[PDB]
Amino acid sequence: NTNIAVYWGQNSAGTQESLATYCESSDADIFLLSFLNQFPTLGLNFANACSDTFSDGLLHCTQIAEDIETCQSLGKKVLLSLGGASGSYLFSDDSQAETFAQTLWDTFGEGTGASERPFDSAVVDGFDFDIENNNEVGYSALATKLRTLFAEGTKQYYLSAAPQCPYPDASVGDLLENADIDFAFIQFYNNYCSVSGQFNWDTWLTYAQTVSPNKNIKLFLGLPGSASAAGSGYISDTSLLESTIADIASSSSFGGIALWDASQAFSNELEPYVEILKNLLTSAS
Numbered sequence: 001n002t003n004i005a006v007y008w009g010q011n012s013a014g015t016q017e018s019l020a021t022y023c024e025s026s027d028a029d030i031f032l033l034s035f036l037n038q039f040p041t042l043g044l045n046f047a048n049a050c051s052d053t054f055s056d057g058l059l060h061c062t063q064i065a066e067d068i069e070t071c072q073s074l075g076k077k078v079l080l081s082l083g084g085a086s087g088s089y090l091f092s093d094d095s096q097a098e099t100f101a102q103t104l105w106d107t108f109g110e111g112t113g114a115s116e117r118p119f120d121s122a123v124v125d126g127f128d129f130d131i132e133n134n135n136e137v138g139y140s141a142l143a144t145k146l147r148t149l150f151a152e153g154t155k156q157y158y159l160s161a162a163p164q165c166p167y168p169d170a171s172v173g174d175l176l177e178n179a180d181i182d183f184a185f186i187q188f189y190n191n192y193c194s195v196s197g198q199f200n201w202d203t204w205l206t207y208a209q210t211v212s213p214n215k216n217i218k219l220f221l222g223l224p225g226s227a228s229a230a231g232s233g234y235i236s237d238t239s240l241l242e243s244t245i246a247d248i249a250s251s252s253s254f255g256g257i258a259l260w261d262a263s264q265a266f267s268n269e270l271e272p273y274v275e276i277l278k279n280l281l282t283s284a285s
């Protein structure tokens, strides 16, 4: 497959534009809103892109809400990503995480429980698990309970995770092994297993075909968008990309490329970096 996924929200480049600006590009297909960085007590952070709040401090983001709807009219998928570098999140047990599934459904999905909605009447297309605190409690139970609740909705919903390339991942490995997940946005950067390093794509294939509860899970080549975007692992060689893309694009388990983040990949020229990669995907396709 040929999808480009981009994280958006954390303003890695400094020059982050509105969510809809990136959706109005031909260059990306899936958008991970970064992040619900605090839970189970809810807290969002989208850098400069949302500053208003409900009275209780929870972000209230009318521009992002409108942009989710615009993005979706244009055929894009927009998931809410949980986690990030805050580490201001943790489940004590599965029961707590199951209760939290309902909370997410009613707050961000098509649940009818009357909760405060950061995105008003906009409805996300699902949830990404970008967990970074090396604590795995609750995520598989959360994902599983979400799958039951989604049947009440009126569109398809997606779950994804954002492991780093070392396998198994210390934060989302359990989730990946014990829940039905649609997409794995694997960070092949900041690690020994970078595409230039000891590229461990084959391990992730073995995972997809033999371990993943969803045998049809799609694996994404996760990359920095610019120099800049990451301490190590940024690629310029169109180069290995072409070959790498070629090497990995043969399997039905290949879903495409995932980028950290939109602000970086769209502004970094090299022609916007995201455009170079979109075109390598279709032409390598």
Ligand SMILES: c1coc(CNc2ncnc3nc[nH]c23)c1
Pocket (backbone or CB within 6 Å): 007, 084, 085, 130, 162, 163, 185, 186, 187, 221, 222, 223, 229, 230, 258, 259, 260
């Ligand atoms: C694939 C491409 O991007 C990801 C998520 N990466 C990511 N998440 C959270 N904080 C980060 N900081 C650098 N990269 C980060 C997976």
